[PDB]
Ligand SMILES: O=c1ccn([C@H]2C[C@H](O)[C@@H](COP(=O)(O)NP(=O)(O)OP(=O)(O)O)O2)c(=O)[nH]1
């Protein structure tokens with residue numbers, strides 16, 4: 400079970416489209432306007448305690464990606480307890496409108512290793 | 523064992539370079555012209571049933587990345603049964619030519635979690 | 646335990662901040678000047694033997710992401726025994742400077758699969 404908190408009543412619970420979907424839909428908590436060739440940190444008003452040995456990759460919705468919208472950053476650490484921001488980059492030709500409640504990205508919980516690092520002289 | 527279909531004869535089986543290569547090579551099944559500052563959906567004519575508790579990341583080739591070619595979207599869900607498409611972004615200064623058979627990207631089967639979500643008030 | 650090798654005394658050992666961090670900080674080994682709209686390969690002068698059944702992802706730092714600095718390529722294969730290079734993309738407005746010892750990205754050891762493929766008729 401992954402515990403999550405809405406910071407304000409503008410936050411929508413992250414949802415999964417289907418039982419075989421890779422990620423959990425993230426929603427914009429506020430209204431944003433993104434000019435062509437600009438980028439914008441979008442607040443979700445969702446904070447969460449991630450599961451152990453993984454991280455949340457904020458990944459792009461495919462439809463938005465064909466409109467020219469990409470993702471910046473997107474690394475949500477296992478110990479990040481703050482507001483989750485989606486960095487949207489408008490690489491399209493037109494101003495991109497974000498309304499409160501718009502599906503803006505997907506959060507994928509990606510399993511990872513935390514290995515020890517040891518310096519040697521030859522591999 | 524991942525099962526895949528060649529939708530048309532122009533589809534080419536994804537292959538790994540080496541036993542230590544992260545990704546399977548995706549090939550273009552058609553011929554494309556992509557001008558500077560534009561993107562294009564490339565059809566592979568491949569569809570596949572992904573391994574359970576995982577997804578397919580369409581990741582960039584290092585070669586094309588240095589020439590300013592990037593990858594959009596890239597999330598290939600576990601329950602996806604359609605044609606796998608690749609979003610090539612041309613951020614370089616010259617028209618990038620896509621020939622039938624050209625390696626364009628690499629599918630990576632990334633291990634993930636599907637946790638249940640529960641709403642709480644404090645973390 | 647993942648072994649690594651410094652190619653020069655200009656390379657800096659990758660670092661961990663906290664138990665819940667995603668990955669390991671990668672540092673520049675040389676001085677670079679990246680003009681707006683350009684990408685530049687950044688040598689870390691670090692070679693390592695990646696652990697089995699995974700790959701290192703050169704992942705963006707959010708601080709830079711917001712300034713307009715994006716990652717290109719970024720797939721470090723299991724059997725890569727060469728110099729790890731970070732492709733930094735200046736999609737910002739000003740020129741981006743990189744001094745030796747600058748925190749440029751993070752490395753994430755993402756768990757992956759190597760399934761055998763099998764062509765079929767139906768799915
Ligand atoms: O680059 C891509 C991205 C997605 N796809 C396919 C695979 C994926 O399973 C499917 C996703 O379609 P949807 O747009 O219905 N879902 P998405 O996750 O993109 O966002 P949302 O569900 O919010 O629309 O499209 C590609 O072929 N290439």
Ligand SMILES: O=c1ccn([C@H]2C[C@H](O)[C@@H](COP(=O)(O)NP(=O)(O)OP(=O)(O)O)O2)c(=O)[nH]1
Pocket residue numbers: 457471472473474475476479482483484485486705706707708709751
């Ligand atoms: O798209 C993002 C990216 C990061 N974040 C969060 C997670 C991360 O823990 C935090 C960034 O904290 P830092 O002060 O460590 N930023 P820095 O640039 O130093 O490194 P990094 O961004 O890699 O943690 O912002 C988001 O909410 N959305």
Ligand SMILES: O=c1ccn([C@H]2C[C@H](O)[C@@H](COP(=O)(O)NP(=O)(O)OP(=O)(O)O)O2)c(=O)[nH]1
Pocket residue numbers: 582583584585586628703717718719720721722724725728729730731732
């Ligand atoms: O950003 C990167 C990406 C890859 N690399 C390394 C790791 C990887 O093993 C290798 C990329 O493979 P190639 O140099 O053989 N290029 P090619 O296009 O042939 O294969 P790939 O699809 O892996 O790039 O370079 C970097 O140093 N920086």
Ligand SMILES: [Cl-]
Pocket residue numbers: 456579702755
């Ligand atoms: Cl990833």
Ligand SMILES: [Mg+2]
Pocket residue numbers: 416420
């Ligand atoms: Mg979906």
